[PDB]
Structures are given as structure tokens and as C-alpha cells.
Write a protein that binds this DNA or RNA. Structure first.
Lengths: 53, 74, 59, 104, 136, 177
RNA sequence: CACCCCCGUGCCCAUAGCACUGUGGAACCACCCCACCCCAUGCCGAACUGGGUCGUGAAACACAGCAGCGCCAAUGAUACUCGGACCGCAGGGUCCCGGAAAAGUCGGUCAGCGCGGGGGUU
RNA sequence: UCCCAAAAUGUAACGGAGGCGCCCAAAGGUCACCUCAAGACGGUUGGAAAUCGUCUGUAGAGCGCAAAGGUAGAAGGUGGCUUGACUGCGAGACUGACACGUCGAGCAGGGAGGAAACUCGGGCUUAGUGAACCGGUGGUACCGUGUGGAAGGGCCAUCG
């Protein structure tokens, strides 16, 4: 879980309007621009999560 | 050089003709040695665990495949 | 000792001790989701024996 | 190749599911459509298109679907799941399906 | 003698005499009466002597090829690794085991070859004839 | 377009000669296989774009880029990367191609006295030695780029090579004469 | 299972397997039959798949013969060993008592036991 | 991770060999299909090895990496769809002096694949790691020193 100059990254996470932190390990190597997934926030759950920041 | 005689653990935890509980760990293995029979589940580490309560069935086919089962005691 | 009050040495009604799960608290996380909720309730009564003595009179 | 069927056959876990498994032999123009027990080595309902197609060919699918479902209606069979051999579950076998399905 | 390819290093133990015969591969033969390791160079000695006595030949068979890396203390002390790969290779030999087999020459011609070659050996030995067939 | 001359003008000629108990034991033909070796010595991802064209021209069928076998030895070799082109031909397309060769491509060739008569597949299948590509009906010097060649393996239901040779000899199999 | 037999599907997961091979043919099964659409082959309906008979049992599948090859494999006697005692400077070896293989030889096989359906005994 | 390790677990050595401090938007979830290394005859860039063809083929291959175990009914190899690399939880067991660590049926909010049974809370498993403390950051609104607010603190994430 160590960090430094290296490739990949640990990129933070958030939702449309919902407030939640996934914090998953991403990688800039093959492709990273869209960090977009589907994850479930505070109440409504059921949302698309843009982890791009 | 040399280093690390490793702890691991393994072995077969619940032996044959032994009465177990639901949730008890029957076999701790590495690959698939012992296949989960009727009444028996297999974890992601290929650990064999008990679904329900009952007695421990050991099944020997000539190995290569062999089976841990759970049959009811009652 | 007098530091350990708000941190959990905490004593129950059966005269037992509250020490749960430390597995990762703040730094170094990013494994699973229920190791994170792995934070527990819990204890052992071996080192509970001399534990309370840190907290002794102030229950 | 011949493991195409043993794939699905080993796939179906009766003992855990508790249900009964529904075999279908799609080979060409005749289908066996048997109903087999989970535990015991027996067979229960088992209709077939073997006799009285009456001009139908792969259209007898729906037919043995209804016939089977009816035969099992006289059993008390309700829970079941669909075995097969190499077969794809597309046209004809889907007919046996939907016809033995609505007629549960 | 010394083998071509391997892993590294070894331990040491003693059982019975297992793979090896009373006879094979010729008429007479020499067999070890005592449990031992036989040095590669020792075999080279028995070989070279028996080849002194048989000026022409092809009647000599050594079933005894050694593979046993042994390591010896380099100069002195203790602090350090277990070390010292190349000292010598040996072939463990247990009694009844066939050491040598020679053919085509006489009774006496075997006797003397075995005596000379025998004086090169850390262990007892003896020469024999053939009766028994175990495997084939 | 043929496929009849197969049955009518071949099958009985065998049973007239060989005389099997049944017409299904008669030597038949399974498929025609066309493999274009590429890459290695001559390698261009552009030249594959070129090859696929002429290869989809003669046969009226799509080709396929065949990657490497993960064989890495001494000279230029790798994990996987297109090493060649493949086209399988069955049925009417097999026959269209085949006869397009027998009647047209084979008769007009430079230095052609026949094809190799000797035993190929001991189990009764066959292969071909095509080298120059300027010998073809759909390839002439009117429109060309470079000069390469193709390989053709011929599969039959034949038992021995002796029978299959005759089989191919029905549609004709020019030998060394 | 009154019986022959074919088709599906089990227990048994090689003493139940392969090879040489003989029988089967309009009952089932198989290929062959054509294929714009279903569906589909990183290309080819070969394999999936969809419309059917003739033709054929060739191949595949099914069954019977067959012990060349595989697999199974005693009895005897070992090797080794729990326990009981000992010899040798040592490498090592013995004795009493039980337990006891591995290989090999004798010989044993080409299985065995179910469910269900279809078709025969002019 | 294997050997030593004395057919249970366990076990020292400056004993004998080799590896880790990662990676993977899929090398995951599911759903469908494909079967490998190799030898032999035979094919134009070959003339040991390329590509194709048929014959043999319990696997002699394969699994990002190190080995052992494992794997032909797949965990191996292509594609379709997707964000279960989920939240709130843990019946009961493996394991450790402790602290850690490990596996796990099942209840619920809910999702994704499949016609369906059903599977999924990361990856064939086994290494890819570090207590507290002090602090950065998003969210929640408990504390907040006469009272109403704020500063500061607390709890759920989480970065060093």
C-alpha cells in the first residue's frame, strides 16, 4: 500500500450528489482517464460513481 | 544462503466418523485434495467448511479425487 | 494508566475488559470492506487480569 | 467435445438445490425428455415424441413439452431444472422449454 | 567418476545393499563385504590397475559410478557457512553389492586382477562365479 | 457449376473399379485448406492488408490473421503476432476454388509438367506445391504489387493414398510424364 | 427383465481401457440432404443450428468374439518396524516377540448393478 | 515456497536451493462456447524452430511472478454483458502467549449475469506488508466550559 513517484495510484472517489469514499487502487498504465464505475451512496444507493478527480 | 522454515499450518482438521457442527472447519488444504461432498462447502482458499450439523463422511476413490461429506446424525 | 481512560481498556458489568480490533485504523488501508468494518467489539481475559489496574479506581 | 454435456450435467447440483432435473435428448427427430430423481437412481415422468408426431418434425417440441408437463402434473412435480446434452437452448429446445413451462 | 550436472550438496546415512546384484555382465566379479563410501579416484585406481593387468580388454565392467558431493573444512574454524563444494564424489556401497565384473579371462586371471584391485579398497572384498538369476 | 460431376462422373467409376459394399465407403472429399505463410523474413502489417485482399478475391471468402504459437527459439521469434493467413473452404466454395484451379490456374503455369505423384499423406490425404502467383485467373500483371505464393492442403475421406490419388485423378491430377 | 433389443440417463469413476476385428440397417441412431431469414462460425453452417427423405452402414455409435498391450493381482519369503534385550572404537550389526510392505511369480479380467421409454417373438 | 522435519500439527542451526515489498479496467463478476506440450509422414518466405494439413496424445502443456499442492467435467484459451474489487452483518470453526491473522453457511438494503437452477462481498490458493501516536482530507451533526452561536474536539470514511 506504499506510495511514491511510481505508476498506478490510489485515487479517491465520489458520487453524483451522494457522499461516499470508495478509495480503490487505480492504474495509469494501460488506461486511466475515466475512473467511472457504478457504486452505492449514503441512502439511494444505486448510482454511477465518477472517481475521476 | 538460507532462510525461513515456514509456519504454514494445514492438515485435515475434522477426521472421519467425527460429529461436527454447522460452521466447523473440516479440512485445511492448499489446492483441491479433498473435494466437498454432500453437506460440505469449499472456501476461496479451498478450505472445507460445514454447511449444516451432522456426521463426517470420508470418501476414498483411489484418491486424485476424494470427498468430505456431511450426513445427518439426529 | 490515567492516559488509558478514553482509549479502550473499558470495563464491563461482569468485571471484564473492552479491547476489540485494531487491524487497520487510520493509515494504510485500501483492503476489502469488512476488514474495515473489521473494527470490532472484543477482548481477552488473560491480560485483562492486570489491565483494570491501569484504570482501577476510576471504573 | 463430448464433455459439452458433462459440463452441464456436472454443473447441475441437485443435492444442494433439492430439485429434480429435466433431461432432454435433442439428437435429431426424436427427443426423450425424461424426468430424473436427484437422489435415487430412478426416473419419474418421462414423456417422449417417440410415438405420434403426426406430421411434425422439430415442431413436436412443443408437443412433448405439453405431454411431459401433463405427465408430471399427475405426479405433483413443481420444482424442476433443465438439463441437456450438447444442445444450445435456442429454437426447438426452447420450444420444449416454454411448452413444458406454461404447462407446469 | 565426477558427474556432469547436478543440484549442489548432500547428507549421509546407512541402509542395506539394495540395487546391485550377485552377478551380471560377464563371468566373474568382485563384491564389497563392508559398508562404505568409495572415492571416485579409488575406483579410478582399481580401474587403472585392472587395466594394467589386462593389456587388451573391454571385459571390465564397473557398476559402481559415484555421485555424492562431499564438502570439507576450507582451512580452519567455524564461523561462516557450511561450505566447500568440491572435495570429492563417492559411491556408497553396502555388502553384496557388485563392485566389479570381469569376463573373457581365466580363473587365475580374475584372481590376481581382483587381488591387486582389492588392495586399493577401503573395505573387504571377494570374487565369485554365477548361479542365480533374479531379474532379466 | 460442378458438384454434380463429383457424384455422377466420379463415384461410380470407383465402385466400377474398387467396388465397395456401399456408396458411403466411396472415397470422398472433406475440405480444401488455403494457408498463406507471412511474417518472419517478410513482415508488414501493411502487406497483410494487401494479402487479405487478393486472398479474399480468388475464393470469395474472408481470411484470418493467424498469430504465433508462442514458439521462441533462436532466430527472430516471439509470443504472438500475426505469422500468417488462413482460409478454409467447404462445399460449393471448395469446389468453385478447386475447379478454378484445375481448369484454369494449373493448365496455365510456366514450367508445368504436372504435380508431384509421390505419396503425400500415408492415410490418404493430399497437399500442393503452388509457388508463383502470376499463374492465376484472378491475378495477372495488369494489377500487381510483388510476387509471393500459397499452399493448399486437400482433405479426403479416402483410406489409402492409392485410392485418393485416383480420386484426385478423376478431376485430373497431372503427374510427372 | 415374461424375453430379445435399441434410445435416453445413473451407481460404479480401467479386474469396467485401447488395438486386431465379426454382426447390425429401414424399429431407434448416424452421416449425407438444402439453407434468405431464426441462430451462428476471430475464416469456413465442418462445430453450433434450422428445414427432411431417398442412399448407405461405410465411418461414428451399439453388441458379440478375442486375454497381443494395458489394469488387477496372491501364497511363500523377505525389507523394514512398535516393544523386549544386546555386540562393535566407530562406520554399523544381532537376538526374542508381535505387526508387516514394495517389486516379482501364480493367476484373475475384458465388467457389474439401476431407472425410464421405444420396438420385436407369422 | 520446498528440504532437513524422524508417514498427525510442531520444531533449531552464520544448515541445504529459489522468490516478495508487485501487478491486473479487467488477468474481475457472470454467462456461453474452444482443449493443450510433443513426435511422424506431407506443404511456396522452411530446409532444428516458423504458418497449414491430417495421425498419435491423461497432459508429457497452460495458469503475470518462486516453488510445492492443485487443476481435462477447468482454475487453461477467445467473446457477450457489466462494476459483488458492494453497504449494514456475522451461526460457527482453523490459528496465535498476546496483539494480529484466516476461512465461512446464512438475514437484510440492494444490485450484475443467466431462460433457468443459481453465482457473485476481487482475483487456483499460498508472499505483494506495519500497532499506537501526532496530523492532512470528505461526510455526519454528539461535545462545546453563564446562555445562542463559532474556534477546537468526537464519531464513519480515508491520505501520510
Amino acid at each position: 500500500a506504499k506510495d511514491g513517484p511510481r505508476i498506478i495510484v490510489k485515487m479517491e472517489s465520489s458520487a453524483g450528489t451522494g457522499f461516499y469514499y470508495t478509495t480503490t487502487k487505480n492504474r495509469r498504465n494501460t488506461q486511466a482517464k475515466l475512473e467511472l464505475k457504478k457504486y452505492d451512496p449514503v441512502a439511494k444507493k444505486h448510482v454511477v460513481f465518477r472517481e475521476k478527480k | 544462503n538460507g532462510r525461513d522454515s515456514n509456519p504454514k499450518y494445514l492438515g485435515v482438521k475434522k477426521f472421519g466418523g467425527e460429529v461436527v457442527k454447522a460452521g466447523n472447519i473440516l479440512v485445511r488444504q492448499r489446492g483441491t485434495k479433498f473435494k466437498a461432498g454432500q453437506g460440505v462447502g469449499m472456501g476461496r482458499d479451498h478450505t472445507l467448511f460445514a454447511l449444516s450439523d451432522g456426521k463426517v463422511v470420508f470418501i476414498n476413490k483411489g484418491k486424485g479425487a476424494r470427498f468430505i461429506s456431511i450426513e445427518a446424525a439426529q | 494508566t490515567h492516559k488509558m481512560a478514553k482509549r479502550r481498556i473499558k470495563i464491563t458489568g461482569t468485571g471484564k475488559v473492552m479491547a476489540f480490533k485494531s487491524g487497520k485504523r487510520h493509515q494504510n488501508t485500501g483492503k476489502s470492506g469488512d476488514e474495515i468494518r473489521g473494527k470490532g467489539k472484543g477482548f481477552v481475559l488473560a491480560k485483562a487480569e492486570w489491565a483494570r489496574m491501569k484504570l482501577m479506581l476510576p471504573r | 467435445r463430448r464433455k459439452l454435456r458433462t459440463r452441464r450435467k456436472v454443473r447441475t447440483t441437485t443435492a444442494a438445490s433439492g430439485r429434480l432435473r429435466l433431461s432432454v435428448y435433442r439428437s435429431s427427430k426424436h427427443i426423450y425428455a425424461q424426468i430424473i430423481d436427484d437422489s435415487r437412481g430412478q426416473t419419474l415422468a418421462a414423456a417422449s415424441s417417440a410415438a405420434l408426431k403426426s406430421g411434425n418434425k422439430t415442431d413436436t417440441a412443443a408437443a412433448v413439452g405439453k405431454a411431459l408437463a401433463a405427465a408430471a402434473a399427475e405426479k405433483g412435480i413443481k420444482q424442476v431444472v433443465f438439463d441437456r446434452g450438447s444442445y444450445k437452448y435456442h429454437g426447438r429446445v426452447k420450444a420444449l422449454a416454454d411448452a413444458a413451462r406454461e404447462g407446469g | 567418476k565426477r558427474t556432469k550436472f547436478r543440484k549442489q550438496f548432500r547428507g549421509r546415512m546407512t541402509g542395506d545393499a539394495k540395487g546391485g546384484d550377485y552377478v551380471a555382465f560377464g563371468d566373474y566379479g568382485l563384491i564389497a563385504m563392508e559398508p562404505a563410501w568409495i572415492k571416485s579416484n579409488q575406483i579410478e585406481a582399481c580401474r587403472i590397475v585392472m587395466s594394467r593387468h589386462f593389456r587388451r580388454g573391454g571385459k571390465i565392467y564397473i557398476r559402481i559410478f559415484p555421485d555424492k558431493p562431499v564438502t570439507k573444512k576450507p582451512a580452519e574454524t567455524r564461523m561462516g557457512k557450511g561450505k566447500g563444494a568440491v572435495e570429492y564424489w563417492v559411491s556408497v556401497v553396502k555388502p553384496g553389492r557388485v563392485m566389479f565384473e570381469v569376463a573373457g579371462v581365466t580363473e587365475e586371471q580374475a584372481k590376481e586382477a581382483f587381488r591387486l584391485a582389492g588392495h586399493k579398497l577401503p573395505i573387504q572384498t571377494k570374487m565369485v562365479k554365477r548361479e542365480v538369476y533374479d531379474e532379466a | 457449376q460442378l458438384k454434380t460431376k463429383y457424384n455422377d462422373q466420379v463415384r461410380p467409376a470407383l465402385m466400377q473399379q474398387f467396388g465397395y459394399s456401399s456408396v458411403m465407403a466411396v472415397p470422398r472429399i472433406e475440405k480444401i485448406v488455403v494457408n498463406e505463410g507471412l511474417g518472419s523474413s517478410k513482415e508488414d502489417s501493411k502487406a497483410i492488408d494487401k494479402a487479405a485482399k487478393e486472398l479474399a478475391l480468388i475464393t470469395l471468402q474472408k481470411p484470418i490473421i493467424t498469430k504465433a504459437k508462442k514458439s521462441i527459439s533462436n532466430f527472430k521469434l516471439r509470443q504472438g503476432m500475426p505469422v500468417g493467413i488462413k482460409v478454409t473452404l467447404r462445399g460449393e466454395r471448395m469446389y468453385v476454388f478447386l475447379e478454378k484451379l484445375i481448369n484454369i490456374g494449373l493448365p496455365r503455369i510456366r514450367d508445368f509438367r504436372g504435380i508431384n505423384p509421390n505419396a503425400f499423406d500415408g492415410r490418404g490425404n493430399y497437399n500442393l506445391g503452388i509457388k508463383e502467383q502470376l499463374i492465376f485467373p484472378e491475378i495477372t500483371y495488369d494489377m500487381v504489387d510483388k510476387t509471393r505464393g500459397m499452399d493448399i492442403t486437400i482433405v479426403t475421406t479416402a483410406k489409402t493414398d492409392e485410392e485418393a490419388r485416383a480420386l484426385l485423378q478423376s478431376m485430373g491430377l497431372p503427374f510427372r510424364k
